[PDB]
Design goal:
2 domains, Rossmann fold, homotetramer, about 25% helix, alpha/beta, 12 strands, seven-stranded mixed beta sheet
């Protein structure tokens, strides 16, 4: 059996996964959903031909997107996840007792449906009382929020649909508006090997509105280049100033209080981008 | 043109590079040598179907294998590189003034020959007076050395051919014998996602003979999983105790005095292996 | 979406089909069954990683295996299909009014099951009163038959399991035994580009027992090289001597009374094999 | 070594050849030339990512394009090959003593150059005194010819560049003009599985100007579907009326006097196209 799913992460480079069978294939109003069972990583979800998560390595992205900003915040209580259909970031947010309510907003309800069905270990906490799942825009949702959230984790850094975010460089100012006075927001910002421009631009644009703008790193083997990047915009708390007593035992497979600080130590060529 | 070179890094997973043309293809006494021109990474050298280096990302491996142990050592003067045919580690070793002589030992002279020819930016320093290039075993060379080297960077951790290294768990004790009383040695020790057993075993076996045994990390996009691992066996100096004044300006694209320490902060699942 | 199924028809050459989703994947007592939906050919069935049929091109094999021997026979009434799980040859056999009963014998009932389910246009006639489907050996079945069939269409030319066919070069003499005095048998005998030896051997071995041994051709785009070969062993009727009045209107997409004769005109290099 | 060259003969289907090394890669004024050494077929030439010929199967195309029209003609003496850079059709034309002069016109001189160098068994006769090689347009050449040729074998059926062929449906009438009063022309016209429209259109357009318009077939394993098609436009001689005494011993590996007629017996679905 030679059934392989290939992702050309670049016109000239990519990864190829051996597939045992497809679990669900569907063209949505928004994208092409494909849950597949791979031999190497277990069930893997692809959106528009690109890898979203897999059972085997999903923990890196989910833990690093959630825990760095939550522990940076002295006491996160109201959190927003935009575009986290698979529910993985929500699963990690719930490990923080301080969180009163975690809202999840994703335009595609079919991502949530099939993740609950085929990625139970990732989407199994969406049914939790502390979670409020909403199938809606997300960018529209941020546009309509005013100092409601302590931490906001965002999927895409480029709004599509109602770009009511007409603030200068709209999006980031839109997020600042939705965040409380000492809010924090995180956005994945690709890899430094094939799309380094994105890191420079986002880093500069976010800095225009947040006094604290840092960039951290993590290894995701299923993502382009194996090195993923995250931009953290903070209004008041420095992620590198976290008090040791602030941490508490939490079950993770990647994140560590030390990794928390070490993820901000960038390889020379990556610092050069900012 | 759809000419692609695929490396099945696992029976069920791999990377695929678009190739413009092959530069040199030859079956050696030792291995299958293939220099190829890739569109994404420039010239790339493959040995027995596996990626060795490429012009675009070679700097990570070369810098992290060389600089971590050299700066850990208060004053490296006599260094040995076993298996560094492409000459990249030698190129980095020469950036340290303290180095009086750097010996390179590789069984395949054809790797050295074609790297000089197609990877000039990597092999261009092998003609330097401070370098002594020897086309010979390497394991036999270590077996026949007695406290001659300050730092020894090793390619493979498993000796083939004359396994005269009959010391208990031979190899490492063989290396301790070739090293000076305060010597340091480094050996790449694969990735933690597909061959985690190797990290556990090497880490344990090296610890049996060196008082200091640490494991550090680096991102190599062309290597399995994007996260590569390195084992450092030290007889006296701690890589995490390097004095700030010890560092000096050196031209690198990845390595940093901070990366030096941060590379030893392991993701939770990786620490679990040791 | 870059999900492709590749068949290395040779260690150095093959075809690659874009897949939309898998329909059924199962490891049987006998083989690895994989029904898949391809974008180019519709549903396609693979057995042990090799293409069996597809909705788009199945007609060539089914028509040429069935019609050449049936029309060569002045009046076929009792026909046997060994290994025709997908029911395609049976579908074609039923277009001949003279056929009183068509027996289908296949070891894997799961091939019949899933072909009925996903290849209805091919397996839809297996429920016909004139058909007798038996999930059993096939070679054992031929070994236990004595002048019962007018025409026998065989899948593999090499018996596995009880090789009770101990007649000199057993199989063909076993088939002659199962055939009536003026019986005819047909067996696909691969392509002349990558496995030409098989054509020489079979042609010679069949000739040892049947006075008439011819080889005919057909284009199957999903099979190795695009040119497939069929061996016809006849005890009395010459496929090239068919009377014009013998033919009658029959619905086909490939086979023609003229193709009937033209399929036996071999390219120079193919004649050289026999 | 897993270096493979894939040709997506359709967005959803293709063939993949294992490559040992590239021989020559060059971007020409006209196209992307790639001579490559494959393990399965020997040296293979690709133009714009599509297979042109290979040492192993080149004989089919070359023989069937040449010999069918030459033997159909009672006495071919002046022959034109448009776009036969590799020189294979020329090699076959020279097997006919009646041919006084064979003109070859190809826009890309580099195809001729590298075919002579890497495909000697195909291009080795272009240095023959009876051959007149011209690196020039081809369509311009046909536009400027007036009853000069007995047989004209054409590469593409769609003129590019100076479309001075303004005759009704220009091209074919342009060819009739270049042909002598009893001339014959042949043009490959793809396969019936993926581009059947082309066969219908060309067949109809050619019939508009030649009293005799037939379509013949041949198996080329390296071309889409394994079944290639050829359109023959004749002003007077019927390719199916060739006298037996007309043939003479000629060395070929595919073509045969019988194949000559059998190639015109089309599978039912192919007849349906015309």
């Amino acid at each position: 059996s030679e059934l392989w799913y290939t992702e050309k992460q670049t016109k000239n480079f990519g990864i190829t996964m051996k597939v045992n069978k497809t679990l669900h294939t569907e063209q949505t109003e928004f994208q092409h959903l494909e849950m597949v069972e791979t031999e190497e990583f277990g069930n893997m979800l692809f959106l528009d031909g690109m890898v979203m998560t897999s059972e085997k390595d999903e923990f890196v992205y989910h833990e690093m997107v959630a825990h760095v900003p939550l522990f940076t915040h002295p006491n996160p209580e109201h959190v927003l996840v935009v575009g986290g259909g698979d529910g993985g970031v929500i699963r990690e947010i719930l490990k923080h007792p301080s969180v009163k309510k975690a809202t999840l907003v994703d335009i595609d309800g079919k991502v949530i449906e099939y993740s609950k069905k085929f990625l139970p270990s990732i989407a199994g906490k969406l049914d939790d009382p502390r979670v409020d799942v909403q199938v809606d825009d997300g960018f529209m949702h941020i546009a309509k929020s005013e100092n409601q959230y302590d931490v906001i984790m965002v999927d895409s850094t480029e709004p599509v649909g109602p770009a009511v975010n007409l603030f200068t460089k709209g999006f980031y100012a839109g997020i600042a508006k939705a965040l409380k006075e000492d809010g924090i927001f995180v956005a994945q910002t690709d890899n430094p090997w094939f799309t380094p421009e994105l890191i420079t631009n986002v880093q500069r644009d976010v800095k225009e509105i947040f006094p604290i703008t840092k960039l951290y790193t993590a290894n995701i083997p299923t993502y382009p280049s194996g090195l993923w990047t995250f931009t953290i915009g903070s209004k008041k708390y420095d992620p590198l100033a976290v008090e040791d007593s602030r941490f508490f035992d939490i079950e993770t497979k990647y994140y560590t209080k030390d990794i928390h600080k070490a993820a901000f130590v960038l390889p020379k060529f990556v610092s050069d981008l900012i």
